[PDB]
């Protein structure tokens, strides 16, 4: 219950996107034009691990093709048409605690101006007060102007305030600034809280 003055921060490439599918399917018709068997399991694995551009490598140079002609083949692809972004089918538990709770949760980025519509076709416009992208100008990465910013926007906690982006990334700017994280990982931060899922992250502050 109770949740004092916290404040959120989202990502918005992974972390609440599940579009992996929408660009995944662009390479099973890469795979496919090779006559190579594409299996989306040892797919979401790999592309987790490495690249999307190893994983042709990886392909062609085992297969006796060439990754020069399967580059241009990941090109002419139609499932970048036939496909859409999802809302991470899961993740509007916590964003309703949260919300509830009076969490102001934000979002950063490098995505464009296009950011901001998809939020507010799936649904969840409401739940980032407000949303940085590529438009924003910040600093690479790590990038502690972006976390003072938000703060200074509503009079926020640096400490109070907790970064999710599932990387080991999300500790250094953090660590800089700061504020904390939340990560599925280890890193070697006191601001770092490993989880497993994303209702994890009310266990937190319910004393897990």
Request: hydrophobic fraction near 40%; charge should be negative; charged fraction near 25%.
């Amino acid at each position: 219950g109770h949740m004092q003055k916290t404040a959120f921060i989202w990502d918005l490439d992974g972390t609440l996107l599940d579009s992996y599918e929408a660009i995944l399917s662009g390479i099973e018709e890469t795979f496919a034009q090779f006559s190579i068997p594409y299996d989306k399991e040892k797919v979401r694995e790999f592309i987790f691990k490495y690249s999307v551009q190893d994983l042709l490598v990886r392909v062609a140079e085992d297969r006796n093709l060439d990754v020069e002609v399967l580059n241009q083949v990941r090109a002419q692809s139609l499932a970048e048409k036939n496909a859409q972004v999802v809302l991470m089918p899961g993740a509007r538990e916590v964003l309703a605690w949260a919300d509830e709770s009076g969490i102001q949760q934000f979002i950063y980025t490098h995505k464009g101006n296009n950011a901001f519509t998809i939020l507010k076709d799936l649904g969840v416009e409401s739940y980032f007060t407000e949303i940085l992208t590529s438009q924003s100008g910040f600093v690479r990465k790590p990038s502690p102007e972006a976390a003072t910013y938000l703060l200074d926007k509503y009079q926020l906690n640096s400490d109070n305030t907790y970064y999710i982006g599932d990387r080991t990334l999300d500790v250094e700017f953090a660590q800089n600034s700061g504020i904390q994280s939340i990560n599925f990982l280890e890193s070697t931060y006191e601001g770092n809280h490993r989880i497993q899922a994303l209702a994890d992250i009310s266990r937190i502050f319910e004393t897990k």
